[PDB]
C-alpha cells in the first residue's frame, strides 16, 4: 500500500525456448560453503540471503565458476557446468555498473545488441530486440538520455540499463549480485518487482542479497538462507517463519524474519572492431571536459616552450639553445601523455575485463579499435603542441623541414602512447603502471643525445639509447634542423650515423614492438580491476 502499484503488469520480452534448470548437488567450497544442494527451474526467483560469499568471490561466482576449489557438482540445463556452457546460457549482473557515461540508453543497447546478436539478424530485428528490452524494463521514458554516472540517469535506471545490457541476447538464466545496493527503498522495491516480472516468464532468476529490509523479503518467491557457508532453509519465503516455528524457533512480533534468522546463525572480428571503434568515438567525442583539459595542456606546454625559446626579436637562438629546444620538445610531452593514457586505461579496466569475460570480443579487435580511437585526438594534440612551436622558435623555414618535424613528433608521441598502453595492460594497479612508465621515461631521457653525449655509455646505456625513442627523436630533429646548412656540427657530435628515413623506420619499429607488447599483455594477462 505504501509503495507504488500503479504500474503495468505486462511482459513485453519473454524467453522463448526450453525451460532452463540449475541443479547444485553437495557443493563444497574451501578457501566456507559446505554441502550446499538446491535445484531451481525456469519461472522461479531464488534469493540467497545470509552470509553468502567466502572472500573476493561470492556464492553466484562459485555457481558460475569464477573465484577456491570445488568438491561437489554443478549442473546447467541437465549438463555439467563448463566455462563455455555458463557464458552460453547464464548472464551475470554485477553490483558495480560499467557503462559509458556519454552514451544514451538506446545507443548503448544498440551497440550491445550489434556486438551480441548473430550476424544473420537484420537491422530491423536488432532494433525490435532493443525496443523490446527497453519496453520490458520500463525504460521508454529514458531511452534518449545519457547514462552518465555528469547528470545522466538515476541509480535504479542505471541498474535497469545494466540488466538490459545483460538481457539483450535473451538469456535463459539470469543472476544478479546485490541489485538493490545503494538504491532507495522504493527504487529497490520497484527493481525487485521488475526482477520478479522477468522471472514470471520462462527465465530462471537468481539474486544475491544481504539484508532485505522487510519489504524485499515479502516479494521473494524462493529463498536460500545461508549461515557461515551452510544452508539452513530452502523454499518459499512466506513459509520460512512457519518452518522455524514447527522446529522450536518462533519469530518474535515486530521483527524481520531474515534479520532474525541470520542473527540466529557471428558477428565477426571486423564487425566487432567497427562497433567497438564507433562506440569509443561516440563516447570520447562527447566528453568536452577531458578534451578541453588535454587541449589546454597541449597549448600551455607549446606556448611555454615557444616563448621560452622565442627565436624572433633582437638575438637569434644559439646552437646549444636550439639543441636544448629540440630535446625539450621531444622529452616534455611524455609526462602528460603517460598520465592521460594510464588514467584513461585504468578508468576503463573493469568494463573491458567484464566484456572480455562475457565474450563480447576476442581481445583482437579491441586493440585496433582502441588504437584507431586514440589516433584522432592524438593527431589533434600533436597539431596543437607542435605547429605553434616551430614558428614561435623561428626554426628552419620551409615546408619540407616543418612537415618532417611534425611527422617525427607525431610518430614519437604515438610510440609513447603505445608504450603507456602496454604498461597499463601489463600491470594491475595504476600506481605500479605509473611508476614503471616513469622509470622507462627517465631511462629513455637519460639515454637521450643531449645530456650524456651518447658516448659516455659503456654497454647497457648505449643499447638503451639505441632503443630509446627520445634519442631518435632528438637525432632526427637535429638532422632536420642542421643538415645541409652545416653537417660538421652534426659530425662533431654523434648525430650523423643514421639517415633520416632510417630514424623514421626505427621509430616505426619501436612503435610496432610496443604494439606487440601491448597486444600480448591484453591477450595473456587478466585486466582485473
Amino acid at each position, epitope marked *: 500500500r505504501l509503495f507504488s502499484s*500503479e*504500474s*503495468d*503488469n*505486462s*511482459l*513485453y520480452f*519473454t524467453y*522463448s525456448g526450453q525451460p532452463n534448470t540449475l541443479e547444485v548437488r553437495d557443493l563444497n567450497y574451501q578457501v566456507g560453503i559446505q554441502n550446499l544442494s538446491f535445484k531451481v527451474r525456469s519461472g522461479q526467483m531464488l534469493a540467497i540471503i545470509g552470509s553468502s560469499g567466502c572472500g573476493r568471490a561470492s556464492l553466484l561466482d562459485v555457481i558460475t565458476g569464477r573465484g577456491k576449489i570445488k568438491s561437489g557438482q554443478i549442473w546447467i540445463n541437465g549438463q555439467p557446468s563448463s566455462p563455455q556452457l555458463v557464458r552460453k546460457c547464464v548472464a551475470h549482473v554485477r553490483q558495480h555498473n560499467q557503462l559509458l557515461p556519454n552514451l544514451t540508453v538506446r545507443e548503448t543497447l544498440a551497440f550491445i545488441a550489434q556486438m551480441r546478436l548473430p550476424r544473420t539478424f537484420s537491422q530491423a530485428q536488432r532494433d525490435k530486440r532493443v525496443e523490446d528490452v527497453i*519496453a520490458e524494463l*520500463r525504460l*521508454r*521514458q*529514458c*531511452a*534518449d*538520455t545519457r547514462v552518465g554516472n555528469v547528470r545522466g540517469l538515476s541509480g535504479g535506471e542505471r541498474r535497469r540499463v545494466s540488466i538490459g545490457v545483460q538481457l539483450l541476447w535473451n538469456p535463459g538464466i539470469l543472476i544478479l549480485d546485490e541489485p538493490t545496493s545503494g538504491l532507495d527503498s522504493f527504487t529497490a522495491h520497484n527493481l525487485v518487482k521488475t526482477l520478479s516480472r522477468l522471472a514470471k*516468464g520462462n527465465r530462471l532468476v537468481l539474486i544475491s542479497l544481504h539484508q532485505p529490509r522487510s519489504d524485499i523479503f515479502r516479494l521473494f518467491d524462493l529463498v536460500l538462507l545461508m549461515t557461515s557457508g551452510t544452508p539452513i532453509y530452502l523454499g518459499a519465503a512466506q513459509h520460512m517463519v512457519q518452518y522455524f516455528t514447527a522446529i522450536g524457533y518462533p519469530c518474535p512480533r515486530y521483527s524481520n524474519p531474515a534479520d532474525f534468522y541470520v542473527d540466529l546463525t557471428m558477428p565477426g572480428a571486423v564487425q566487432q572492431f567497427t562497433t567497438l571503434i564507433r562506440r569509443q568515438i561516440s563516447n570520447d567525442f562527447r566528453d568536452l571536459p577531458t578534451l578541453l583539459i588535454h587541449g589546454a595542456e597541449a597549448c600551455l606546454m607549446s606556448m611555454t616552450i615557444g616563448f621560452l625559446y622565442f627565436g624572433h626579436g633582437s638575438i637569434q637562438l644559439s646552437f646549444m639553445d636550439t639543441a636544448a629546444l629540440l630535446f625539450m620538445i621531444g622529452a616534455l610531452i611524455p609526462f602528460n601523455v603517460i598520465l592521460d593514457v594510464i588514467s584513461k586505461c585504468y578508468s576503463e579496466r573493469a568494463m573491458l575485463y567484464y566484456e572480455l569475460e562475457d565474450g563480447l570480443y576476442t581481445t583482437g579487435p579491441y586493440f585496433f579499435a582502441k588504437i584507431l580511437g586514440e589516433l584522432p585526438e592524438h593527431c589533434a594534440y600533436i597539431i596543437i603542441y607542435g605547429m605553434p612551436t616551430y614558428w614561435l622558435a623561428n626554426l628552419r623555414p620551409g615546408l619540407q623541414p616543418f612537415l618532417l618535424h611534425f611527422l617525427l613528433v607525431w610518430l614519437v608521441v604515438f610510440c609513447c602512447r603505445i608504450m603507456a598502453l602496454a604498461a597499463a595492460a601489463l600491470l594491475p594497479t595504476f600506481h605500479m603502471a605509473s611508476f614503471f612508465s616513469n622509470a622507462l621515461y627517465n631511462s629513455f631521457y637519460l639515454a637521450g643525445g643531449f645530456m650524456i653525449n651518447l658516448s659516455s655509455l659503456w654497454t647497457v646505456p648505449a643499447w638503451i639509447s639505441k632503443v630509446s625513442f627520445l634519442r631518435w627523436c632528438f637525432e632526427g630533429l637535429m638532422k632536420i634542423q642542421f643538415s645541409r646548412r652545416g653537417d660538421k656540427i652534426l659530425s662533431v657530435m654523434e648525430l650523423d650515423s643514421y639517415p633520416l628515413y632510417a630514424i623514421y623506420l626505427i621509430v616505426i619499429g619501436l612503435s610496432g614492438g610496443f604494439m606487440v607488447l601491448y597486444y600480448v599483455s591484453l591477450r595473456f594477462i587478466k585486466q582485473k580491476p
Partner: antibody
Amino acid sequence: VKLVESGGGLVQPGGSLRLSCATSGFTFSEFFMEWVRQPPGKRLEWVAVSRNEANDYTTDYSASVKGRFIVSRDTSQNILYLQMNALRAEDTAIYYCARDAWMGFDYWGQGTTV
Amino acid sequence: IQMTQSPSSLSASLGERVSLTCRASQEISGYLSWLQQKPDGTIQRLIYAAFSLDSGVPKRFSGSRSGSDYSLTISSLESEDLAHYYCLQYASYPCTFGGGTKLEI
C-alpha cells in the same frame, strides 16, 4: 490484418452487454488486444487490454471500468469478447478494437455504438 | 502524461500544408503515434514512433520534433484528409491520447 467489431445495441443502465471483435489476418495468440472507447464529448479513453499467450492471457482494465468490465478471447475462433455489466452510466461510446497498445495502436476496427 | 493537441480545429484547402502540434507533460522519448479517424468511423494509424510511417500511408505525412513538441505535417493536402487526428503516447502506463484536431476544408 482485419478487425471487425459487432454486438453494439441499445441497453439502458441496469443491464449488460457483450461486444465481439472478429480478428483476422494474424496469429491471434501472439498479440495483445485492446478495447478503447470514444465518448461523444471525450477525445479518447483506453478501456481494457488482454495480453497474448506468453502472458497466460491475463487482463487489465482502467480505473473507470475496473470491476464492471471483463475482457476475454476465444483462441479457437480468434474473437475478442468484452462483457460490460452495470453499463451506460457514462459509458455511451463508439468502442473500438485495436491490436497493440505498447507498440502504438495499429490496425483499428470500425467501432460499435452503445 | 497529459497530451495537449493544438489546435482543436483547423480549416484549410487543397494544395495547402498543415501542421498539428502535440505537447506531452513528461518526456516520452519520441514514443508518439499519430492516428487518423475518417468521418465514417474507421481509424488508421498514420505515424508510429513520431517519425516513421505505416505501410500504405501516403508519403506526404511527416513527423517532426521541436523541443518537447511533436508535429504532424501534412504537405499537399487533399480532400481525403478531412478527418480527425489524434496524438497518442505509449512510453508510460497507462496509454493516454491527445485532445484531437478536426481538419476541416
